[PDB]
Design a protein around this nucleic acid. Sequence first.
RNA 1: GAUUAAUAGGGACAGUCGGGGGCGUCAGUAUUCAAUUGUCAGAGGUGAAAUUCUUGGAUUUAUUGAAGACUAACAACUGCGAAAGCAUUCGCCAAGGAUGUUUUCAUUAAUCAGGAACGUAAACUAUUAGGGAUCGGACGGCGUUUAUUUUUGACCCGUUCGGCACCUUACGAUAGGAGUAUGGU
Lengths: 115, 49, 66, 49, 201, 103, 104
Amino acid sequence: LVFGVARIFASFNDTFVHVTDLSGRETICRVTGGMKVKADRDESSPYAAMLAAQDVAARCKELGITALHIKIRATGGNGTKTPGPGAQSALRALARSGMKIGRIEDVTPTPSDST
Amino acid sequence: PKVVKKATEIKREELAAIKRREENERKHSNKKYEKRKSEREKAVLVKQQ
Amino acid sequence: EDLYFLIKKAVAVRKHLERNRKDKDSKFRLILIESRIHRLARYYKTVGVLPPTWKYESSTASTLVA
Amino acid sequence: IGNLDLRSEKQRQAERDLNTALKKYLRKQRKKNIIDEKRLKAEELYRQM
Amino acid sequence: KWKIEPFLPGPFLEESSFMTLFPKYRERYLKDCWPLVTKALEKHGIAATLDIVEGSMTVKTTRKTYDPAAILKARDLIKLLARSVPAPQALKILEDGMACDIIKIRSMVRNKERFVKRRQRLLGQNGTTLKALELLTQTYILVHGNTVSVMGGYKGLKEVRRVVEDTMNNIHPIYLIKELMIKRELAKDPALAHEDWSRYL
Amino acid sequence: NDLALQRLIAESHILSEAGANPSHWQSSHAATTGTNTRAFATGRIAKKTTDMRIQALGAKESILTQQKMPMNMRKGIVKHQEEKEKKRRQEARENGIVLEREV
Amino acid sequence: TTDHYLLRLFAIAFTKRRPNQIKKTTYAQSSQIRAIRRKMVEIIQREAASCTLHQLVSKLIPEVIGREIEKATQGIYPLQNVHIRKVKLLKQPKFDLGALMALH
RNA sequence: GAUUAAUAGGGACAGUCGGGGGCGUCAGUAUUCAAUUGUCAGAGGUGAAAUUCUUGGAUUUAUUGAAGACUAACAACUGCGAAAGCAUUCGCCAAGGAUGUUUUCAUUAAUCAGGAACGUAAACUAUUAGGGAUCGGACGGCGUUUAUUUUUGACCCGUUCGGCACCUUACGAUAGGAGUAUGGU
């Protein structure tokens, strides 16, 4: 079981399913939400997150890591500090297609004082 | 009448507060190892001839 | 003396105010303490314990710390 | 009509004067799952037993 | 494209667990509203314990939990239960299309009496503007001290975010409710489906 | 000046206690309560809103309220309503929730 | 540390609610908070200036520092839990494979 | 030759108290900008879009550096300042409040004409008589924890001054619009 670290940037406009190694430096495979949906309205949707998570899990099972540590974030500076629908739907599809999940953490950038 | 009823409610509140203050001072002071003095005995301050 | 301690507090306030120069709360307390000094000084003039030509503006502060 | 309310009389006197079951206790209180410091004391008692 | 299916069917290696801390006045209400919470979280597969001694709600993923987003649902649920949302609403976050949000509004007004006036202006006369916002945005809004806790769909989360910031920035919520009613009337007919609607507000 | 804005603000209590907000817990309970899943619930809400509209137009008394009660029913009803509002005010003074100010 | 690594230690410490109490707020006074912070920085300096980095990590793992802060601050105001929330290594001036392989 | 020492003053000392003020210093993230890598097709907004940035690689991932801002959560039916206002640590500088004292001059005082210092908004509105909370002293103590035992502090309780606010009671008080017509301009 080779643990890869999946950054899921779930905003309200698009979701980013991103898979890196344990370092954070070397991106293995990323599929954004809007490259699976023709409509910019429905770019941030549970269907978009499901398609992105299926493609990412397929690539990472072709590479043979079959285990992820998932770090979920959102727009946190002056944003909302809550993930969009992409987080729940991508984690659901990601563990529904293989991918024994390891450690889940919501690493949102929380400002001590922004404005 | 309303004045007598309101003032006896106030008197009940004040007497319950005084009893609670005395009971707390008894439970947390050195008076705990004594017999409770009855109220009819507390009615008289001193008697002299 | 009450007047002596009041003018001592006044020189201390004015020296801190000269070193800092930016704050306003010390200036307001200086205005309060100089009004207090002048009122107590006027009562001591109308009693007569001190010279009626004795005055404190800043030179008496300077010549009583000096 | 006129007999004692025994529960109310016991509560009145209370407010005036003021190894086989302790396993099914934990069996009934592991299901809540409120931790409830009396259960912490019961866990320490079961560890001693 | 937007609907979400319930999870039909061990996806967890490290046994995840989350905690939140509550005070005593919430400890009473949580102690006598807890069996509803642990019943629904047992239906989702997650063990939920409450600690009145330290004052801590814990969730933890059991052996037989299958939904992996259930731990995020449970973490948000115990966050709202600590932040004194009532218990059926906190359990209503466990549906698929709901999400919560906390809006920090104390940073938006320098003054204090002006902040109190604008917060009560957000709350409205007899709560009518607040429940009008809840109706027009399909949300649950709770004006919580210095924060505002909202729940609902993500569209409603965005609209109540805009309305709460504009209410704190001295635009009136009655004006914003009129704006939202105009937007609802325009989105009713799709003959005007893609124009710039700024000519109407 | 605006009419339907004034109607939406006043009747929001009745609509959001009837059925119209499925993310609110009281409305999601009252959407399955039974007196709103019955056959003509929308018409009964329409009668309540029309009564409130004539009250806003200037009627001093209502059509929907009952006028004669045996004094123990009305005292129990008014006392229970006042104790409920007082308990909500106290449980909102604790937890720091701010509420609508009304005497 | 004694191996000339500069590092920052960020400690957090929450106030102990005493059992058998009735008052809801366990507020320490501000002067009492300043005394607690003074004893906290004194403890972490006196018990992190003497050891090397490997012994410092071996003391950080079972949280000996937070335990000793909890033990020594309870005469000023009892603290519910003391943790060290961050360690940041700023500069490491040496690359030595001898000690770096004596680790592994 | 010089009164009560005021349940009005001003001052002194002691332990203090405060997100009161000034100057320096220390941090914390977040944002922007730049650099180094892994990138490899969109990203961004919106109810939808569009302007814009995008194979010289945008958005993203990681690590540093700079700049400016602000001080989350704690954070209150609280604290401080006369007011606007005041929340990172530490140091310095004066000032202020209350308490206690086995502290002093003994009317110094109260009020404001004149004058003097500090400075995008609005939009639903002599006691009351105590009680429950609250914080700042001072005193007292059956006791739990510091405490290896004395300090001392935390918790509980009582007394006493002082102050922000709650509720009850008052002790009382008191301060033209809308329609419909008709005739002119």
